[PDB]
Amino acid sequence: AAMSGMLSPELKQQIIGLAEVRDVFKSPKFGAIAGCMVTEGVVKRHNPIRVLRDNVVIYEGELESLRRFKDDVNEVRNGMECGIGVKNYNDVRTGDVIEVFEIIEIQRTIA
RNA sequence: AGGACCGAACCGACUAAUGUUGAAAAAUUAGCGGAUGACUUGUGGCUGGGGGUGAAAGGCCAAUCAAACCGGGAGAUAGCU
RNA sequence: GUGAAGAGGGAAACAACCCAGACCGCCAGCUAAGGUCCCAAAGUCAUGGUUAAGUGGGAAACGAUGUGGGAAGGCCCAGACAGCCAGGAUGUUGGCUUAGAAGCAGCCAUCAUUUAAAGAAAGCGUAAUAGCUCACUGGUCGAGUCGGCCUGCGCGGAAGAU
RNA sequence: CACAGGUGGUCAGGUAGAGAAUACCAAGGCGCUUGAGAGAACUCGGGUGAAGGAACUAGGCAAAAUGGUGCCGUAACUUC
RNA sequence: AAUUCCUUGUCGGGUAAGUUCCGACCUGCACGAAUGGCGUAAUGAUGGCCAGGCUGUCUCCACCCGAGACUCAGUGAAAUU
RNA sequence: GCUCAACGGAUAAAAGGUACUCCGGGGAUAACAGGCUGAUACCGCCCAAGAGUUCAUAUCGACGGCGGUGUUUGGCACCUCGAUGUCGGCUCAUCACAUCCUGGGGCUGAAGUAGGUCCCAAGGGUAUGGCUGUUCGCCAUUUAAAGUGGUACGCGAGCUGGGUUUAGAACGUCGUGAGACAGUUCGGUCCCUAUCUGCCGUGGGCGCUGGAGAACUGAGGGGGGCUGCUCCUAGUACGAGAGGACCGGAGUGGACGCAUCACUGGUGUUCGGGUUGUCAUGCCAAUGGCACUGCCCGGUAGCUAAAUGCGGAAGAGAUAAGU
RNA sequence: GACGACGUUGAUAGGCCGGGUGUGUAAGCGCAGCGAUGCGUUGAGCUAACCGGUACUAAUGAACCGUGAGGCUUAACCU
RNA sequence: AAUUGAAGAGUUUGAUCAUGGCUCAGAUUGAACGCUGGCGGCAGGCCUAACACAUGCAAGUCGAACGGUAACAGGAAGAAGCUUGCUUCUUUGCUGACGAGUGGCGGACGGGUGAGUAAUGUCUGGGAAACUGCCUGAUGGAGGGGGAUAACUACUGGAAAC
RNA sequence: UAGCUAGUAGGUGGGGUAACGGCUCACCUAGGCGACGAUCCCUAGCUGGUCUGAGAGGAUGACCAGCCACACUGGAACUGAGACACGGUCCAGACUCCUACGGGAGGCAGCAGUGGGGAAUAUUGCACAAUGGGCGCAAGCCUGAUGCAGCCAUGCCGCGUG
RNA sequence: CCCGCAGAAGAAGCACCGGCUAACUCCGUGCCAGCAGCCGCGGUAAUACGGAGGGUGCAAGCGUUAAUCGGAAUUACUGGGC
RNA sequence: GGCCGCAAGGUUAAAACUCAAAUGAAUUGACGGGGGCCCGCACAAGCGGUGGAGCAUGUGGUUUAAUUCGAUGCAACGCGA
RNA sequence: UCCCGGGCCUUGUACACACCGCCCGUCACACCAUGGGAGUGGGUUGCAAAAGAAGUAGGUAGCUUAACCUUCGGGAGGGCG
RNA sequence: CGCGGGGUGGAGCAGCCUGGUAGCUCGUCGGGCUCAUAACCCGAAGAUCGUCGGUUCAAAUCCGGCCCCCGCAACCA
RNA sequence: AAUAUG
């Protein structure tokens, strides 16, 4: 039992939401704000994201600020206009899609 | 000695309940603050409306005030009900 | 086009839907839409069929020997289809990047003998032999049998709060 | 309004008490202009309470509790 | 932080358990030196947090004493329609 | 001779705040809520590559599809702006079943115990705290289980006013400023005596066919329907072992409901006693008034819980899913 | 309102008599002490609504409302 | 005849002399560890946990204080299996002794420990206000009576202790 | 650590101890101790000696012997000449054992020995033959005091390994 | 304690050797691996490491470590400075 | 930590740890943008050049299959050659 | 007199791998011990209260009691509480 | 359509209303100073003066367009 | 006032 607990396995990396960004905006703090439109799922704040262009991943990271208008809501559903920005991401281009995914741990047993 | 301390009258009105066509168009009950001071109160006077006064809230100026009341312009105007 | 500015009849109720434009009066008749078992005025009318779900009387993808009708086809008294009595093999335990494989998640072709017929292949599935059953085939029984197409009406899918 | 409100000054008894507090009384003035019964709900204003003692709640709100004189004693901190 | 959006930041103390609180870090969205900065004894019907005591605030409400309600007699409203 | 560009040109010549506000109107037009719709959401299903040591469908499920429910996030502005008080809590519920537990059953990659998933089932039950105004959520510790929803995101002519759209003030930020923020921070009046409908109770009138007093048959309607742990069977079945039953029977609890005061207690200002201050009955003694019953100590009945008795069932009939 | 008991051929209520329960050694008097105070008399006095008895007082004889043989038709019995 | 004995070196600087610290040669220990290891004598041997303990033993002894037979060692008496010289088994405290009990004296010595205690302590040097078993010296009493008790019997409370 | 002391300092009277005394009370007086270190804090048994040193000193207090204190922790009394009692009594605390669950029993800082500490220190031995105690007239009994042996090179000293 | 029996038979290790400090060369390693009390050795001739030969000290003991004094006239009264 | 002070600070006064020296003075030599004295195309006073121009030669650099190796401030660069 | 190189004497010095020397501190990196540090968690101990086993000492109505006194009925004294 | 100030060499300027070979700084590449480097000193490279039309003897400087940068603007998930 | 530094 002591051994089984020791294990730390998370077996799920399922996407929480997938969104495409369009019409980039400029921000002083993060350097960029990429306007987005969520096509599927729900976008969340602290959940990690995977930025990819043409099926290959241009950049990776975890969201710092999710803001729509001046509301700055922590959650955005699908087919609702949304806004996004992140630190350490220099180049925003249209046509790419950002994939957000939640992280969960399955847990482990000994045998 | 003291805009000192506790505490009646006196002045002030923080909390709670009652009252909410009430007894009262802001009070009663049980608590509470100051209470020799920037204190309080009588009587009379002065400051008059785009003006007054204001330890300043746009409060107060006769049960009212982001401009009193009364009369007149006046049957203002109202593309509105 | 109707209402708005049109009442009336029907659609249970329901301006705008259907039928139809109210001059007034009558205790007449024939009709429109819509109906004809009763509530509620008129067929429990007549004739040929469908459904058995209360479908009708809300709801799809999709599923199913529900049932009605129709045009063709495969197999079959040299014995079909479904039962029952049997056989179920040899190259071959098949070479094999193989610990072990002798059919199987693996390997590859998928060829080749004996035979009425039996696949280097169908499986619940072993420590490996297997134990067992099936495709295929013999005997028994003796007349229909198998499942695609077109189409009527039904079935499940079908769970909401007074 | 015959209104639980407001309204300046003067007079200041006995006992207990520091006291014009407060209680009980003297002098004096009052029982407040609807009463009678019933003794349920429930509300208003009060008293008491087993055990637990803030678990209530936005919040110790409200209640409860502390409550006087003399002596002893009295911390952090300080502009002493 | 009366200032901090993300946010209940992260760390430590308190609690069985603390989005508040107390003490730090500093990534100060958006403190900053008389539109004053940071301390500060005393003081406050001041804001937030904690302990003791204390108790019908509560678990969970019971009884009792008054004034209404209730009945009878007299007088006799109201908003509304 | 006019970018009178707002271009059929109101002046030659004009920008703002109002939460200190005010007037006239509007559901012609927003916010709360209803309604329509169902994209979105939630839920169920169709195809099944693949995962599952083999094996699609024990349990999951790519790539895509088709519905349901009216339930979140939205759309529209149809009801109400000569007024429908908005978040939550408290109190009080009621219904739906896509069932959290208990009851029944299939499959299981179901040994047993304990689970997974799906069907049938709404009778009953379905936690108290810490922090935050919060619902929610996180955390602590319980419980057989701490269901998911409707009901104007139930419920203010019932309560709360902490959140949040007033009037004070301040910080941060924005503007030159008045001020502003869907950014915080402190403080900040919750009216209404019930005609009708409804319900909880309790009466009067009349009828039921001559009138009257009793006892009933029971159409119909309501209440109740919860469950742990322990022991025996049995340390038996099962299982390598650890561990550990079904079926059936016997005890004792938690919550809830009804009754009751006999006990154990509370109350007990109508009973007795102690005692502070004062006045009075001439005074002493002994009593009485008043001061929250003056303050206290005990306590008769009655009422009542924390107190002690009992209940939920068994059995019968027809069935759901299943066999 | 109703509902239950009883109204003199009477225990309905109040009182009364006894008992219980409650409080817990009254008042008076005597004794001891200077006095407060104690002690004996004495578990005394007093005691609501409770328990068991008792007509002592009050529930008097009457009126009021309510009636006087109870429809028609048919069937089965009976003169 | 008897507390008759005194060592230095290395290192600061390019080198030198002072000042000055550090380091080493000596002896010693209630020692340990590392490696090795023949015998003997004497002495030493939980310095930390004053941390806690199994088991045996570490204080008993007097019959010459006293009532006593509970043990086995005799002697005595009796009854028997018999070998004619003995054993065997019940009586008797007659005795060598002695369980338990009353009494006397010792359990205040011996042994252990170094927790406390910076002075009711210790060491040293004085003092006066005391007692002191057993052991000694000195001068006299040891007269005469009474009422209890353990042990042991009769019961009874205990699981054991009592 | 510069101020510390109410029985505190002294007296009188009473009680108290075997004995002087604030030893312990009543009353009276305001003194007592302290810079020559009171009080408080930290550490520690002291001494003959041990070790070192030429000496003076320094460090040290095993074994041996004297004195003191302590006996699981805390507190108190009894018996007795002597104990405010190591293996005695009671009470309380912690701990362990026995139990019929009502209640009892136990204290290695004695000798051996074990757990545990730590770098590390011992045989659950033999004998009362001796020496010194206890009791007794004595025999004699008891004596983990003592005398001996075992163990380890721990130290000192002698000898061998030619 | 004494007598007899058999036979060199049964019995020597440890530190250290750069100076202090008695006692040296070679080989290997090459600021590597290690030594060390102090000052210091080793980066390709190491008497300083490791091994070997030789040697010195000491002996059932030998070293290291810890402990106290001495040296330390460096708490100095004896017996020092400013 | 105590005392003193309005403050700044004073006063009394450690330990852990770390280094193997620190310091004093003196000597020789070097150096000084220390002083004196003194010499040399060292400067001054002159004359003619280099650095530019074209070429030669040596070097570095670059490049290359090799551009052999060595010389590098004066004291290497028509150097060894 | 000035620049460069050199000699002699004298002077200063923290240079003696000899001024191309030596050498200070912030800051950045790593390690070590230590101070302050909201408080937490122990030891020991002062002061002011609570508590009162066992035992001893005092005071005792009650219960009980072989030795001694007696008028034989009980005392004196003891113990238990 | 909407304000400011500027365009010169690699970068930033001066030369402007005062119209005749465009000079002044940092960089660039050399040289000098030093034992050497930093620093400093002597020097050379380096241009349609934004781009055009106007205008003039010759316009860098003269006007207006095209155009660009900055300024505040005004935007600012 | 001419210069660090190595």
Side-chain angles (χ1 to χ4, degrees):
Chain A
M3 294 178 43
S4 287
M6 184 65 73
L7 317 197
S8 306
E10 63 183 6
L11 216 158
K12 307 306 175 176
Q13 274 213 12
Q14 57 192 0
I15 58 186
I16 191 66
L18 184 176
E20 183 178 2
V21 296
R22 58 202 65 178
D23 188 5
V24 62
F25 297 98
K26 183 180 293 296
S27 178
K29 183 178 179 180
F30 295 95
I33 191 66
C36 42
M37 294 300 293
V38 177
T39 186
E40 184 67 14
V42 176
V43 175
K44 298 300 287 185
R45 182 60 59 86
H46 298 306
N47 293 132
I49 71 177
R50 181 177 181 170
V51 177
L52 60 83
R53 181 177 65 83
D54 290 344
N55 193 30
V56 296
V57 59
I58 303 301
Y59 176 77
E60 295 193 36
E62 54 195 7
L63 285 177
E64 183 65 13
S65 64
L66 177 64
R67 178 182 293 177
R68 70 168 313 180
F69 290 75
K70 306 173 184 179
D71 291 344
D72 189 4
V73 64
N74 291 283
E75 61 185 343
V76 175
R77 293 178 179 83
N78 60 344
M80 184 174 63
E81 183 178 2
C82 99
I84 288 172
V86 293
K87 57 176 172 57
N88 290 336
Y89 184 77
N90 190 30
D91 187 5
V92 177
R93 295 181 181 175
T94 59
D96 59 8
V97 296
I98 295 172
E99 294 178 350
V100 60
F101 57 89
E102 189 173 6
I103 61 171
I104 318 175
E105 36 200 339
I106 187 54
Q107 299 189 156
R108 285 186 173 183
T109 292
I110 191 66

